[PDB]
Design a protein around this ligand. Structure first.
Ligand SMILES: *C/C=C(C)/C=C/C=C(C)/C=C/C1=C(C)CCCC1(C)C
Ligand SMILES: CCCCCCCCCCCCCCCCCCCC
Ligand SMILES: CCCCCCCCCCCCCCCCCCCC
Ligand SMILES: CCCCCCCCCCCCCCCCCCCC
Ligand SMILES: CCCCCCCCCCCCCCCCCCCC
Ligand SMILES: CCCCCCCCCCCCCCCCCCCC
Ligand SMILES: CCCCCCCCCCCCCCCCCCCC
Ligand SMILES: CCCCCC
Ligand SMILES: CCCCCC
Ligand SMILES: CCCCCC
Ligand SMILES: [Kr]
Ligand SMILES: [Kr]
Ligand SMILES: [Kr]
Ligand SMILES: [Kr]
Ligand SMILES: [Kr]
Ligand SMILES: [Kr]
Ligand SMILES: [Kr]
Ligand SMILES: [Kr]
Ligand SMILES: [Kr]
Ligand code: NA
Length: 272
């Protein structure tokens, strides 16, 4: 069996079928566009912090720190892609390069462990809770977020070798995920009490963005197996789709999320 590409799904397909120049180039450009948008996000949150009352600026700060970590780690992920796979002129495809370092989703997973807590935390600086304690929500978010990403990371090891383990850890991870959604809805509901109808409208959009953007991750996790073990997506197409959904998700969950919280902060601040 394959000793080289046993690490993850990307390595496996790279070590066996290889990637068409279209698939490799597409994935390369989408990862580059990924970190490019984080760098543009970083400068947006820096330049706009003066547009919100001091009260809300901790949200804009956390957006900025998320953009820094995202840019740096997704830049690493992009380099990790182009370095891991070299062209073979004989076969006319890209294959896992033994002389390079093997492809590694650890860059993105580490980014998640850092950003998930900050992203969950930062809404508590724009909204006021009603009947819930700030510390309780914070602790619930931080714990469930860490556990979601840790169980998810553990599950990701058994992605190729043991699908039973892959899905069980994935389901454990999904349990913590559903708890986060449940608390976030509660937070957003309490957030709507006490604010103008304009601000309640933005919180509605934040909720839908949050719900969709965050649901793309377990989608991308499962992406290789959504058509079976011999399916359309058990190929370079599964790798394409996954890295594309991860990028869409990362841009929506971090950058768009942050822009809507800043907009919320602005309609709250200086608007009477
Ligand atoms: C800035 C990056 C963000 C918001 C990352 C979010 C990550 C998740 C919501 C991932 C959760 C997962 C599951 C629900 C099950 C499978 C494993 C994960 C980690 C992909
Ligand atoms: C009133 C709201 C204004 C929305 C502006 C959003 C700007 C966010 C910056 C990130 C997007 C730029 C993408 C560039 C890719 C390189
Ligand atoms: C009042 C200052 C507002 C300036 C915002 C300009 C947005 C810059 C986009 C960065 C990419
Ligand atoms: C729970 C998530 C923990 C992720 C740790 C993995 C760190 C990998 C760093 C980049 C890849 C190194 C090669
Ligand atoms: C009590 C219900 C609140 C949580 C809403 C969850 C929506 C579906 C999750 C999709 C995955
Ligand atoms: C119905 C109102 C739509 C605005 C909310 C945001 C749209 C969802 C974006 C999904 C993220 C990918
Ligand atoms: C006034 C409300 C506007 C909110 C929408 C802001 C969307 C910014 C998009 C940034 C990411 C674009 C990625 C390019 C592909
Ligand atoms: C690359 C784009 C940063 C503003
Ligand atoms: C890594 C710890 C797993 C806990 C499962 C509930
Ligand atoms: C991968 C680009 C993200 C598109 C913004 C909605
Ligand atoms: Kr900032
Ligand atoms: Kr940076
Ligand atoms: Kr950081
Ligand atoms: Kr860099
Ligand atoms: Kr899920
Ligand atoms: Kr939570
Ligand atoms: Kr809450
Ligand atoms: Kr690919
Ligand atoms: Kr997106
Ligand atoms: Na290469």
């Amino acid at each position: 069996t394959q000793e080289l590409g046993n690490a993850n799904f990307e390595n496996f397909i790279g070590a066996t079928e290889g990637f068409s120049e279209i698939a490799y180039q597409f994935t390369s450009h989408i990862l580059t566009l990924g970190y490019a948008v984080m760098l543009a996000g970083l400068l947006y949150f820096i330049l706009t912090i003066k547009n919100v009352d001091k009260k809300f600026q901790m949200s804009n700060i956390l957006s900025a720190v998320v953009m820094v970590s995202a840019f740096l780690l997704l830049y690493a992920q992009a380099q990790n892609w182009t370095s891991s796979f070299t062209f073979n002129e004989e076969v006319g495809r890209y294959f896992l390069d033994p002389s390079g370092d093997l492809f590694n989703n650890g860059y993105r997973y580490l980014n998640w462990l850092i950003d998930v807590p900050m992203l969950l935390f930062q809404i508590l600086f724009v909204v006021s809770l009603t009947t819930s304690k700030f510390s309780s929500v914070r602790n619930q978010f931080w714990f469930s977020g860490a556990m979601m990403i840790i169980t998810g990371y553990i599950g990701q090891f058994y992605e190729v070798s043991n699908l039973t383990a892959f899905l069980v850890w994935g389901a454990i991870s999904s349990a913590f995920f559903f708890h986060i959604l449940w608390v976030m809805k509660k937070v957003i509901n309490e957030g709507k009490e006490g604010i103008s109808p304009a601000g309640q409208k933005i919180l509605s959009n934040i909720w839908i963005l949050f719900l969709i953007s965050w649901t793309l991750y377990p989608g991308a996790y499962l992406m290789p197996y959504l058509t079976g073990v011999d399916g359309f997506l058990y190929s370079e197409d599964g790798v394409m789709a996954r890295q594309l959904v991860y990028t869409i998700a990362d841009v929506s969950s971090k950058v768009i999320y942050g822009v809507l919280l800043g907009n919320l902060a602005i309609t709250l601040s200086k608007n009477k």
